[PDB]
Amino acid sequence: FNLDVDSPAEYSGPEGSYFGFAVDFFVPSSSRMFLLVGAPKANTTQPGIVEGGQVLKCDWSSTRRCQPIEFDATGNRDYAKDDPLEFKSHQWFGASVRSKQDKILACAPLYHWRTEMKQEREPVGTCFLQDGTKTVEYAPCRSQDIDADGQGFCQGGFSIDFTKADRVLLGGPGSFYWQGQLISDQVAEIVSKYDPNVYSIKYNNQLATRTAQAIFDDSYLGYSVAVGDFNGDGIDDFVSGVPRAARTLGMVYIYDGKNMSSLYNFTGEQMAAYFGFSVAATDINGDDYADVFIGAPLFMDRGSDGKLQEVGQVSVSLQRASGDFQTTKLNGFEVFARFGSAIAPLGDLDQDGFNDIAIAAPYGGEDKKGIVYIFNGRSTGLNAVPSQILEGQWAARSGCPPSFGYSMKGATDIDKNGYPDLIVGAFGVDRAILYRARPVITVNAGLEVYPSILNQDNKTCSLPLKVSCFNVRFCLKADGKGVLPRKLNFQVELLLDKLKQKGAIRRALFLYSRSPSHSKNMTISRGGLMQCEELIAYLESEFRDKLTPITIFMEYRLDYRTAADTTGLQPILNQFTPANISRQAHILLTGG
Amino acid sequence: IPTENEINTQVTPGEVSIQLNFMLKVHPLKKYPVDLYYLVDVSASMHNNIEKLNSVGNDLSRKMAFFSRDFRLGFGSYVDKTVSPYISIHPERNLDCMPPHGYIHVLSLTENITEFEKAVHRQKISGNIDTPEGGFDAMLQAAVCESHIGWRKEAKRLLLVMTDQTSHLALDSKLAGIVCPNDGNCHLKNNVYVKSTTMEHPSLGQLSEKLIDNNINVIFAVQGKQFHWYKDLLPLLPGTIAGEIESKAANLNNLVVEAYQKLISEVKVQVENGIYFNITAICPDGSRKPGMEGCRNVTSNDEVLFNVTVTMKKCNYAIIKPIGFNETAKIHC
Ligand SMILES: *[C@@H]1O[C@H](CO)[C@@H](O[C@@H]2O[C@H](CO)[C@@H](O[C@@H]3O[C@H](CO[C@H]4O[C@H](CO)[C@@H](O)[C@H](O[C@H]5O[C@H](CO)[C@@H](O)[C@H](O)[C@@H]5O)[C@@H]4O)[C@@H](O)[C@H](O[C@H]4O[C@H](CO)[C@@H](O)[C@H](O)[C@@H]4O)[C@@H]3O)[C@H](O)[C@H]2NC(C)=O)[C@H](O)[C@H]1NC(C)=O
Ligand SMILES: *[C@@H]1O[C@H](CO)[C@@H](O[C@@H]2O[C@H](CO)[C@@H](O[C@@H]3O[C@H](CO[C@H]4O[C@H](CO)[C@@H](O)[C@H](O)[C@@H]4O)[C@@H](O)[C@H](O[C@H]4O[C@H](CO)[C@@H](O)[C@H](O)[C@@H]4O)[C@@H]3O)[C@H](O)[C@H]2NC(C)=O)[C@H](O)[C@H]1NC(C)=O
Ligand SMILES: *[C@@H]1O[C@H](CO)[C@@H](O[C@@H]2O[C@H](CO)[C@@H](O[C@@H]3O[C@H](CO)[C@@H](O)[C@H](O[C@H]4O[C@H](CO)[C@@H](O)[C@H](O)[C@@H]4O)[C@@H]3O)[C@H](O)[C@H]2NC(C)=O)[C@H](O)[C@H]1NC(C)=O
Ligand SMILES: *[C@@H]1O[C@H](CO)[C@@H](O[C@@H]2O[C@H](CO)[C@@H](O[C@@H]3O[C@H](CO)[C@@H](O)[C@H](O[C@H]4O[C@H](CO)[C@@H](O)[C@H](O)[C@@H]4O)[C@@H]3O)[C@H](O)[C@H]2NC(C)=O)[C@H](O)[C@H]1NC(C)=O
Ligand SMILES: *[C@@H]1O[C@H](CO)[C@@H](O[C@@H]2O[C@H](CO)[C@@H](O[C@@H]3O[C@H](CO)[C@@H](O)[C@H](O[C@H]4O[C@H](CO)[C@@H](O)[C@H](O)[C@@H]4O)[C@@H]3O)[C@H](O)[C@H]2NC(C)=O)[C@H](O)[C@H]1NC(C)=O
Ligand SMILES: *[C@@H]1O[C@H](CO)[C@@H](O[C@@H]2O[C@H](CO)[C@@H](O)[C@H](O)[C@H]2NC(C)=O)[C@H](O)[C@H]1NC(C)=O
Ligand SMILES: *[C@@H]1O[C@H](CO)[C@@H](O[C@@H]2O[C@H](CO)[C@@H](O)[C@H](O)[C@H]2NC(C)=O)[C@H](O)[C@H]1NC(C)=O
Ligand SMILES: *[C@@H]1O[C@H](CO)[C@@H](O)[C@H](O)[C@H]1NC(C)=O
Ligand SMILES: *[C@@H]1O[C@H](CO)[C@@H](O)[C@H](O)[C@H]1NC(C)=O
Ligand SMILES: [Ca+2]
Ligand SMILES: [Ca+2]
Ligand SMILES: [Ca+2]
Ligand SMILES: [Ca+2]
Ligand SMILES: [Ca+2]
Ligand SMILES: [Mg+2]
Structure with a gap:
């Protein structure tokens, strides 16, 4: 709920380059931070290559300049005279990007090579890894096991990720007649074992899935990947979606990160819903147990009228110490919006103590501009009601819809205000947007009325004649996590006896003001105890109705403009905190 | 409530106007x-x-x-x-x-x-x-x-x-x-x-x-x-x-x-597009199923109608299509 939407940082790339198809944060090990954006169809300087694609590094401060990252300036290598070895044209480089401190890994899943035995064009896929200075190539699917029977069409790099222990996890959905394949290699070995003259490099401590029976053909293992511990060993385990497995019913395999031994299987529920298009792993209930989020963008729900409505669905499986999962589902909202296309952990967005998450509907909203919903984690799991809705601000430039939300990455505090932020890509319009998290303020308000029971014949106070009177006292304190100003300015507006509308008479007014209203600018220090202020208010010949109670209502609103920082990011108030409170008073009736 | 004139639809009635239980007759x-x-x-x-x-x-x-x-x-x-x-x-x-x-x-x-x-x-x-x-x-x-x-x-x-x-x-x-x-x-x-x-x-x-x-x-x-x-x-x-x-x-x-x-x-019937609808079946033989599950074996001659119960909660036009058919029934505090 605390994402700045009035002034997010907007970045753009070359028209038609699909700028924003994949986004990520680049945070070197006490150094400036940058955005990373993939442009898979971008033309390049490397000679004789059309739409080779690239990966842009976008500055954080000052101008929003995006400069490409030079992973490889060379054209297609020849294996023999007029016998090209590879085909980088339309290889879709930058379609998959992941960063980890000094390491940046990009991949071209439509890269082709001829093979060393015959003249073919097989999409083995390739990647380029860059640390501090070195820049190596990583093609674990271009090998001797060629053609569809092996890794010929593996498209290695279709999806990637890092593990906590600097280990690359790569998915190749086309291995072994599209049974898919997962490959895990230590970064140190991808670096050390690199050789410019060997095209099928062998890595010692490699982990990879083994070809299986034909029943598993056309299952697309590795379509999407994610990492997280799911056996209590500390080693990040591998998670991958298999959207065509189980007779196009979809599945999600979880393998041990230590030796690629099968750990768990999730199975879809509806055929062709593409259960397993997107996958994410994060502890959403603060139990320190990684939870699994699985997307099915094509899911159809049957509501009241029986009509099936394609709205998509996301399964939230909370891990328990026992081993199994407590699974709860979450349908979309708009038809054909493909809710669940992208799933991005955000960290503790509101810094409430439970991680949060964003789920995309890239083809929803007015004119299919695309939407991103935000959900907050709770002790009980995920709050199924989204606390924020982000909408694209561009229309169909050409053919492909904006696709705002198709890609997005969070959980990084780029401005260093104590809260993670979010990047959202919209490749159909060649844009990427950085939404920054506003610091959350928690406010405690107090209101006391003494005496609560009024006495019309009391007449203690002396109006500047005498009238019966009482005291109205409002207190206020506030504090919050992260970076915020030391003095917070709230304006409090008090009104007396609201239940009687303006058209009707009022009975309780203030002494010094002679008015029912009272406004006050109040500068309270942040994190201190309650600053309080009380004032006197007085009250038969002017009204007959005494049976209706007297409500004393107070609302408070902080001054955003003065509380903003130098970058302009204004603080925000906690989402579940009433902006107003009230007390009551009554008159003694006859009695005795 | 009110039924339109001149029929000329195979699902009867062809158009209805209710403002908040009736039966519609499909017949192949x-x-x-x-x-x-x-x-x-x-x-x-x-x-x-x-x-x-x-x-x-x-x-x-x-x-x-x-x-x-x-x-x-x-x-x-x-x-x-x-x-x-x-x-x-x-x-x-x-x-x-x-x-x-x-x-x-x-x-x-x-x-x-x-x-x-x-x-x-x-x-x-x-x-x-x-x-x-x-x-x-x-x-x-x-x-x-x-x-x-x-x-x-x-x-x-x-x-x-x-x-x-x-x-x-x-x-x-x-x-x-x-x-x-x-x-x-x-x-x-x-x-x-x-x-x-x-x-x-x-x-x-x-x-x-x-x-x-x-x-x-x-x-x-x-x-x-x-x-x-x-x-x-x-x-x-x-x-x-x-x-x-x-x-x-x-x-x-x-x-x-x-x-x-x-x-x-x-x-079989399917409705498209805030209001709930409840359907019951009326097959040639005594069978009572929800609208989404239309009768089977239906002889071409025998009439077949469905009940609709309309219950609005919040204070447009909906369409009720018998799948496979080209003619339809439009229905309009
Ligand atoms: C999650 O879900 C996934 C998939 O849905 C599960 O993964 C699958 O698990 C099953 C069971 O473990 C795997 O099947 C196994 O297949 C082996 C065969 O080994 C293969 O490789 C050998 C090397 O090439 C090869 O020799 C084999 O030969 C095949 O072809 C011949 C015909 O020529 C045939 O006769 C063989 O049977 C093989 O099919 C083969 O290619 C097999 O050995 C395993 O069987 C064990 O148990 C049987 C008893 O039924 C016994 O006879 C065997 O000796 C062996 O002890 C087993 O059937 C399958 O490959 C996996 N697929 C994938 C994609 O992973 C996973 O287990 C699930 N996990 C959880 C936690 O639910
Ligand atoms: C990166 O740079 C490359 C070039 O280096 C661009 O590729 C060109 O893109 C333009 C689009 O603006 C293409 O223009 C179209 O060409 C079609 C014919 O191309 C075929 O034939 C050639 C050989 O003659 C082949 O090389 C090619 O692969 C195709 O097989 C025309 O039929 C099109 O006509 C239609 O569009 C025009 C508007 O441009 C209309 O006026 C016409 O009436 C008709 O509707 C069109 O002209 C061009 O062919 C592409 N060239 C190549 C070599 O691919 C990328 O677009 C560019 N990408 C980015 C992101 O910058
Ligand atoms: C990858 O590593 C995982 C574990 O990290 C491994 O899964 C485990 O494999 C071991 C085999 O070493 C399994 O342990 C066996 O389980 C069966 C049934 O539960 C027992 O009957 C076995 O008991 C005998 O074998 C022991 C072997 O040490 C003997 O010491 C003992 O005296 C018995 O004779 C045995 O304990 C274990 O169940 C799984 N799973 C787990 C959660 O531990 C997986 O096999 C590895 N895959 C590789 C290396 O490819
Ligand atoms: C006619 O009205 C007048 C006032 O308009 C009223 O005089 C009241 O007398 C009582 C004594 O009987 C006073 O009592 C205290 O007043 C202070 C306010 O200065 C309060 O803060 C006191 O409560 C505090 O302490 C309590 C501990 O016992 C806490 O529980 C409480 O939360 C407070 O912290 C206590 O109420 C009273 O102050 C005055 N009125 C005013 C406005 O000061 C008079 O009694 C009325 N006529 C008759 C016949 O009673
Ligand atoms: C939904 O579909 C129904 C079909 O059941 C449709 O109503 C039907 O329309 C057709 C239109 O041709 C009617 O067929 C005509 O029937 C008369 C008498 O039987 C024939 O004389 C007509 O002759 C035509 O065909 C000749 C050769 O086949 C041509 O030479 C001649 O020029 C004519 O084109 C014609 O066959 C049929 O009778 C109706 N049936 C009913 C029950 O109404 C209905 O219109 C469709 N809905 C919409 C909105 O269009
Ligand atoms: C009337 O419908 C029933 C089912 O609704 C038919 O029963 C089926 O008969 C076929 C063969 O004719 C079998 O293959 C099915 O397994 C049967 N299903 C059930 C549920 O009984 C019955 O045949 C139909 N009557 C006629 C005359 O066709
Ligand atoms: C129906 O289709 C056949 C198939 O073409 C037609 O036969 C053709 O007749 C023309 C003369 O008008 C010949 O030149 C073709 O060689 C014939 N084709 C074959 C395959 O024999 C026939 O005329 C069509 N009938 C009508 C009424 O249009
Ligand atoms: C339709 O009626 C059935 C009872 O036959 C009931 O269970 C169901 O909830 C109703 N549906 C709606 C949308 O009211
Ligand atoms: C006071 O806050 C409540 C929610 O806590 C809200 O429903 C109500 O409208 C508010 N009253 C005014 C006068 O704004
Ligand atoms: Ca085919
Ligand atoms: Ca593990
Ligand atoms: Ca958990
Ligand atoms: Ca949170
Ligand atoms: Ca931040
Ligand atoms: Mg075929």
């Missing part, structure tokens, strides 16, 4: 004009099936003309999207094959049947790599391209898709770099799906919507084990049925007629 006619469109996968595995159907449609027209007053027949072929990794993109690439292709509408519905025979034998076979075949794009195109294929607004519009393996899905396209969802509109310039390499396959939701809107009843004629695949998808596409082409084949005519008499033997 016996002799229905029929529009049969053979959409066939022409991949390698189908060489036997194509050869078989060279002169079998000529026979079926006998039974069908006996079943239906009018009868017309059209034909179209499909394979897969002509882009890697679905096909081999070597400038060459073993027996007599034609180049791959998304979808070609070759013959519009016509009564002259020998034209269909001449068109099918003239058909040749292609080939690709991945086992599943992009059939759903062809289905959508044959559905929405009403004028090109020539679907009559009166005839029962049957689309017979003939294959042997599973069909491709929309998100499958992402592998090829095709990430622009299907737009669901006709894109045939010279009877060729020009958008085969630019848009994803249509999702089942889009396809169901386009079939229901164009009132197309699909018949999945398949051979291999994947029959069960197309069978388990039936609940997701109403007004659709599947038939297994048994090993030896040649049951094509008998299969499609067994499938035809099964939709005349079923009248």
Whole structure:
């Protein structure tokens, strides 16, 4: 709920380059931070290559300049005279990007090579890894096991990720007649074992899935990947979606990160819903147990009228110490919006103590501009009601819809205000947007009325004649996590006896003001105890109705403009905190 | 409450205006004009099936003309999207094959049947790599391209898709770099799906919507084990049925007629678009089922109505379609 939407940082790339198809944060090990954006169809300087694609590094401060990252300036290598070895044209480089401190890994899943035995064009896929200075190539699917029977069409790099222990996890959905394949290699070995003259490099401590029976053909293992511990060993385990497995019913395999031994299987529920298009792993209930989020963008729900409505669905499986999962589902909202296309952990967005998450509907909203919903984690799991809705601000430039939300990455505090932020890509319009998290303020308000029971014949106070009177006292304190100003300015507006509308008479007014209203600018220090202020208010010949109670209502609103920082990011108030409170008073009736 | 005049709809009443329990009478006619469109996968595995159907449609027209007053027949072929990794993109690439292709509408519905025979034998076979075949794009195109294929607004519009393996899905396209969802509109310039390499396959939701809107009843004629695949998808596409082409084949005519008499033997209702509706069944025999599950075995003569209970909670017009039919009932603190 605390994402700045009035002034997010907007970045753009070359028209038609699909700028924003994949986004990520680049945070070197006490150094400036940058955005990373993939442009898979971008033309390049490397000679004789059309739409080779690239990966842009976008500055954080000052101008929003995006400069490409030079992973490889060379054209297609020849294996023999007029016998090209590879085909980088339309290889879709930058379609998959992941960063980890000094390491940046990009991949071209439509890269082709001829093979060393015959003249073919097989999409083995390739990647380029860059640390501090070195820049190596990583093609674990271009090998001797060629053609569809092996890794010929593996498209290695279709999806990637890092593990906590600097280990690359790569998915190749086309291995072994599209049974898919997962490959895990230590970064140190991808670096050390690199050789410019060997095209099928062998890595010692490699982990990879083994070809299986034909029943598993056309299952697309590795379509999407994610990492997280799911056996209590500390080693990040591998998670991958298999959207065509189980007779196009979809599945999600979880393998041990230590030796690629099968750990768990999730199975879809509806055929062709593409259960397993997107996958994410994060502890959403603060139990320190990684939870699994699985997307099915094509899911159809049957509501009241029986009509099936394609709205998509996301399964939230909370891990328990026992081993199994407590699974709860979450349908979309708009038809054909493909809710669940992208799933991005955000960290503790509101810094409430439970991680949060964003789920995309890239083809929803007015004119299919695309939407991103935000959900907050709770002790009980995920709050199924989204606390924020982000909408694209561009229309169909050409053919492909904006696709705002198709890609997005969070959980990084780029401005260093104590809260993670979010990047959202919209490749159909060649844009990427950085939404920054506003610091959350928690406010405690107090209101006391003494005496609560009024006495019309009391007449203690002396109006500047005498009238019966009482005291109205409002207190206020506030504090919050992260970076915020030391003095917070709230304006409090008090009104007396609201239940009687303006058209009707009022009975309780203030002494010094002679008015029912009272406004006050109040500068309270942040994190201190309650600053309080009380004032006197007085009250038969002017009204007959005494049976209706007297409500004393107070609302408070902080001054955003003065509380903003130098970058302009204004603080925000906690989402579940009433902006107003009230007390009551009554008159003694006859009695005795 | 109020019933419109001059009827002229097969579902009675044809238009209603209620402002907040009534019964609507659907009744299928016996002799229905029929529009049969053979959409066939022409991949390698189908060489036997194509050869078989060279002169079998000529026979079926006998039974069908006996079943239906009018009868017309059209034909179209499909394979897969002509882009890697679905096909081999070597400038060459073993027996007599034609180049791959998304979808070609070759013959519009016509009564002259020998034209269909001449068109099918003239058909040749292609080939690709991945086992599943992009059939759903062809289905959508044959559905929405009403004028090109020539679907009559009166005839029962049957689309017979003939294959042997599973069909491709929309998100499958992402592998090829095709990430622009299907737009669901006709894109045939010279009877060729020009958008085969630019848009994803249509999702089942889009396809169901386009079939229901164009009132197309699909018949999945398949051979291999994947029959069960197309069978388990039936609940997701109403007004659709599947038939297994048994090993030896040649049951094509008998299969499609067994499938035809099964939709005349079923009248199911589906409402589109804040208000809840509750439905009960009134079959010839005493049966009481929810509207989504329409009676079966329904004899063409017997009347069949449904109860509707309308209960609005918050203080437009809705449409109640009996699937497979072309005429409908519009209904308007
Ligand atoms: C989650 O879900 C996934 C998939 O849904 C599960 O992963 C699958 O698990 C099953 C069971 O463990 C795997 O099947 C196994 O297959 C082996 C065969 O080994 C293969 O490799 C050998 C090397 O090439 C090869 O020799 C084998 O030969 C095949 O072909 C011949 C015909 O020529 C045939 O006769 C063979 O049987 C093989 O099919 C083969 O290619 C097999 O050995 C395993 O069987 C064990 O148990 C059987 C008893 O039924 C016994 O006979 C065997 O000796 C062996 O002890 C087993 O069937 C499958 O490959 C996995 N697929 C994938 C994609 O991973 C996963 O287990 C699930 N996990 C959880 C937690 O639910
Ligand atoms: C990166 O840079 C490359 C070039 O280096 C660009 O590729 C060109 O993109 C333009 C689009 O603006 C293409 O223009 C179109 O060409 C079609 C014919 O191309 C075919 O034939 C050539 C050989 O003659 C082949 O090389 C090619 O692969 C094709 O097989 C025309 O038929 C098109 O006509 C239609 O569009 C025009 C508008 O441009 C209309 O006026 C016409 O009426 C008609 O509707 C069109 O002209 C061009 O062919 C592409 N060249 C190549 C070599 O691919 C990328 O677009 C660029 N990408 C980015 C992101 O910058
Ligand atoms: C990858 O590593 C995982 C573990 O990190 C491994 O899974 C485990 O494998 C071991 C085998 O070493 C399994 O342990 C066996 O379980 C069976 C049934 O529960 C027992 O009957 C066995 O008991 C005998 O074997 C022991 C072997 O040490 C003997 O010491 C003992 O005296 C018995 O004779 C045995 O304990 C274990 O169940 C799994 N799973 C788990 C959660 O531990 C996986 O096999 C590895 N895959 C590789 C290396 O490919
Ligand atoms: C006619 O009205 C007048 C006032 O308009 C009223 O005089 C009241 O007398 C009582 C004594 O009987 C006073 O009592 C205290 O007043 C202070 C306010 O200065 C309060 O803060 C006191 O409560 C505090 O302490 C309590 C501990 O016992 C806490 O529980 C509480 O939360 C407070 O912290 C206590 O109420 C009273 O102050 C005055 N009125 C005013 C406005 O000061 C008079 O009694 C009325 N007529 C009759 C016949 O009673
Ligand atoms: C929904 O579909 C129904 C179909 O049941 C449709 O109502 C039907 O329309 C057709 C339109 O042709 C009617 O068919 C006509 O019937 C009369 C008498 O039987 C014939 O004389 C007509 O002759 C035509 O056909 C000849 C050759 O076949 C031509 O030479 C001649 O010129 C005519 O074209 C014609 O066959 C049919 O009677 C009606 N049936 C009913 C029950 O209304 C309805 O209109 C469709 N809905 C919408 C909104 O269009
Ligand atoms: C029905 O289709 C057949 C098939 O083409 C038509 O027969 C053709 O007739 C023309 C003369 O008009 C000949 O030139 C062709 O060679 C014939 N084709 C074949 C395959 O024999 C027939 O004329 C059509 N009938 C009608 C009424 O249009
Ligand atoms: C009336 O419908 C019932 C089912 O609704 C039919 O019973 C089926 O009969 C077929 C063969 O005719 C079997 O393959 C099915 O397994 C049967 N299903 C059930 C549930 O009984 C019955 O045949 C129909 N009547 C007629 C005359 O066709
Ligand atoms: C329809 O009626 C049934 C009872 O036959 C009830 O269970 C169901 O909730 C109702 N549906 C709606 C949308 O009110
Ligand atoms: C006071 O806050 C409540 C929610 O806590 C809200 O429903 C109500 O409208 C507010 N009153 C005014 C006067 O704004
Ligand atoms: Ca682990
Ligand atoms: Ca957890
Ligand atoms: Ca949180
Ligand atoms: Ca931040
Ligand atoms: Ca295919
Ligand atoms: Mg085939």
